[PDB]
């Protein structure tokens, strides 16, 4: 009404990008909620500088909408006249022309531009929202925002890209019964009413959009301090607080360990952690009050697993790094988000690992982030980590593996190639240069480049300017040629064209009989290059360091499989899980023969490492799930499996002993075992079950979520069922919740699921930021694959108008689909996107998918009598 949708495109406006000449300085930012009737009011005053003549002044806005017209002030004070305002749907624009025209700001003086404004808190969990918990039987409320990427916008109106920093002083009209939080401490507290009190925050360093964050609370808190003596507190609510003393010790650990690191304070004098009750993502490092799911903060000893422990430390010292990359140095536009995403993703790790010793942290790197990124970057479908965006789904689409998992991975390559104390050096520097700024890619490199003189750019810009990545071909014992590798052989390698040919800058390391060499292959070396003494064997690529693949000379193969059988400890345990994870994306690609891979498994009745038996676990599960309806394969492959992890899953028993990495251990060894139908473990499985439901035996901590969904599979039934759901209910630990969860998706009853996918629309029995998380647990039922495939299309549009198409987890949904391996199903998936062709952030979701389920099919085709064989004439 006030400011009216018009479709006039006539203007800068029409633009996707912000104009180079308007510049904001300072935002004062005011809200006032009203929580019981899901509204808020504001207004804000933005400083602007302005270098071009312009009748337009245009800025985000999505949503929530402009109440009083707007007023804009000349740097010399006088109030400019306003002739229209109007909103520009297609690009999230409000924009406002005054009546002439007026001139940049040459000097110290600047224009002001102030809107009144009024949003919503309901149907949302993205802007400024409000939800609710239960405390003492009664309902409270508690209100926050969430912005990354594009949703400043919603919750007020401002210039929402990332290199547009602003500096910024908030504050907050609130019942007085609340608290208030932000990015900077509390200035000063005024009473409106005897009612309402006003809560101003001190004034913010220089910060993007994205990372401006208030809430209003009633939590308790549990405190710490800092070597530098700030205030590191951990909000929470009361019936939780003590959940919150682990977060609150590697929250002090991984910030005094940074600060030292990256040789540089910390800009602000307080830091507040938070989890809200419903969250949207996993956490978001809001700078000074980083928000969080609570399953990635609020831990229990007695009763979280230590796979939730390393979760909450990790995510913590996620959080904590991007204080450093992505707030005081910020990507200068979203195609450099790995600049925030992947150096987070690798110095999580670095943060953990000093707080805690005996995790074996830098080698987890290869679990958690290289070897399952390696899988998604061998696809057509994936994208080169600098990528273009052009659209706000095209922005969060990019907060994906290859910004996460391969940023992390090319900089553990780069690290380890560069040397760990030129890289902190290096980065150290780039720290100082752009503080309070923002950066490229190629910034970084420089940075690098001045503290070692190598060639970082020339080298790096290979890994990062093109999708994919090589396989080194080994010829003789050290004749190596690189060829880019992919899951599917008949894909055409030159696409999508790059400038660089799918050709890189390998630094290439490997191990002569105990002793270590270093070779850049340069991509000019058409031919390859030699390995540089009188050698029986070379092991390329010691601990996976560099992000590639190393095809071995089928003999080479053949006498790895054979010294693992004699003695197994020949190499490390990362080693073995490279050579393990290699062979078998090689056998999957048609680059090696399937019977060589699968001769890397008979040693494995010895095998006792962590590393090398989630990779064989990974590489068995998709084998196993491309037969699972194939009743001459399926029993073959199980029997043998089921053989080769009996011993260590029988060693290790069912009882939480041992130290961390041990304990993580036997929770996979044991779910394998169940996975593969050992009857004495489906047994245990099924016991402490039965104890469980008899409610008092509380059951070890690193085999709940195991018996519950394998108790619940082979002996759950409605009264369990029911009983299994009262208690997600009951448990105020959202980690034992998300279990809970996991167990009700476990039953063998269509009926019984069908009552679970209904309740994905009572928000009083599932929240909003867990409806994807159990479609998903669903899917992976026998049964429920199909179902929640039916259920996601048959409630598609539902889930649109609750969600959005800006929504990334809604985009990746159709992931669950990942298992299909038949024409009938690719078809059934194609059918379905033709129907609903606006994918918005599930575009690539949707390209990737279909490129998975038509490798499936070919896969099935090409390999079935190959493993059929290798199987039969073993057993
Ligand atoms: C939970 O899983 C355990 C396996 O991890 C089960 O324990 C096993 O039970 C088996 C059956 O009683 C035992 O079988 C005997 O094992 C010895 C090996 O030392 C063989 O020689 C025997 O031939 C074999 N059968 C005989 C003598 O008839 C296992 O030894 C035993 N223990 C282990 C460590 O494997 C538990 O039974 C199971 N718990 C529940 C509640 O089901
Ligand atoms: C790498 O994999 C190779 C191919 O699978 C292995 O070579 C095979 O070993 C099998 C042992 O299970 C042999 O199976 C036998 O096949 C004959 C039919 O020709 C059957 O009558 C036998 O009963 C059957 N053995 C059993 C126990 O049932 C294969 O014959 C044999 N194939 C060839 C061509 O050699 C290699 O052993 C393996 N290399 C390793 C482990 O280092
Ligand atoms: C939040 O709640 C308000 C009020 O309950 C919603 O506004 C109503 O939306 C319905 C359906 O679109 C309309 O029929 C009503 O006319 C609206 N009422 C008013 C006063 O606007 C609002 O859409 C909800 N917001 C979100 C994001 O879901
Ligand atoms: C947080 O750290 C504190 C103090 O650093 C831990 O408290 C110690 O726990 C150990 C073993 O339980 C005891 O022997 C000590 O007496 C405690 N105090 C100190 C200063 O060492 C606490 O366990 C940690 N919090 C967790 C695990 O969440
Ligand atoms: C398990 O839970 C359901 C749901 O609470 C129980 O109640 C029935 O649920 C159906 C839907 O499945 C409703 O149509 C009925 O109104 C419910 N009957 C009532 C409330 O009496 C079901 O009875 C429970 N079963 C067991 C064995 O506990
Ligand atoms: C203003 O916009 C420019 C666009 O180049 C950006 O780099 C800068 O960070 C913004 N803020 C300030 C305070 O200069
Ligand atoms: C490897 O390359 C070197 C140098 O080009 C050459 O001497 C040798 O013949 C090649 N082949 C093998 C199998 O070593
Ligand atoms: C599934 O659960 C329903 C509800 O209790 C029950 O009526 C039915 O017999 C069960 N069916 C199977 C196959 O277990
Ligand atoms: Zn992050």
Redesign the pocket.
Known sequence: DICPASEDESGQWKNFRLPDFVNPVHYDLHVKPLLEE?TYTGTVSISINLSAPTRYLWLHLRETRITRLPELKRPSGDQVQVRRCFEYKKQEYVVVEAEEELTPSSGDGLYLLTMEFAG?L???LVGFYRTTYTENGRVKSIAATDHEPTDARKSFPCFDEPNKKATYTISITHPKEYGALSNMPVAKEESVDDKWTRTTFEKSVPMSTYLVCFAVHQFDSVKRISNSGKPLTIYVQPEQKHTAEYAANITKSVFDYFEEYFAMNYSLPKLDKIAIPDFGTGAMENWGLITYRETNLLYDPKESASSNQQRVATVVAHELVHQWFGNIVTMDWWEDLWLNEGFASFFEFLGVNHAETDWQMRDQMLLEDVLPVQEDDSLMSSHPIIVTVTTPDEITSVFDGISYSKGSSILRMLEDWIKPENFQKGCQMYLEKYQFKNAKTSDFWAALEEASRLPVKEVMDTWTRQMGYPVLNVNGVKNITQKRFLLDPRANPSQPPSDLGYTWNIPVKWTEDNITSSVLFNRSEKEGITLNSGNAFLKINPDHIGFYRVNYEVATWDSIATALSLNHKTFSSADRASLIDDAFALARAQLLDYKVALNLTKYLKREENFLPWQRVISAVTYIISMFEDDKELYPMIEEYFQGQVKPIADSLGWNDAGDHVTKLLRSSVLGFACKMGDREALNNASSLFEQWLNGTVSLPVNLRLLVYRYGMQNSGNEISWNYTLEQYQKTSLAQEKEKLLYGLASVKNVTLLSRYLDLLKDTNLIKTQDVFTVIRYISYNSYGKNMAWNWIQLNWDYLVNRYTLNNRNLGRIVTIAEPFNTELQLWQMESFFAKYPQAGAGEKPREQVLETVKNNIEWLKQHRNTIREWFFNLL
């Open positions: 899901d919503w309901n149907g949302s």
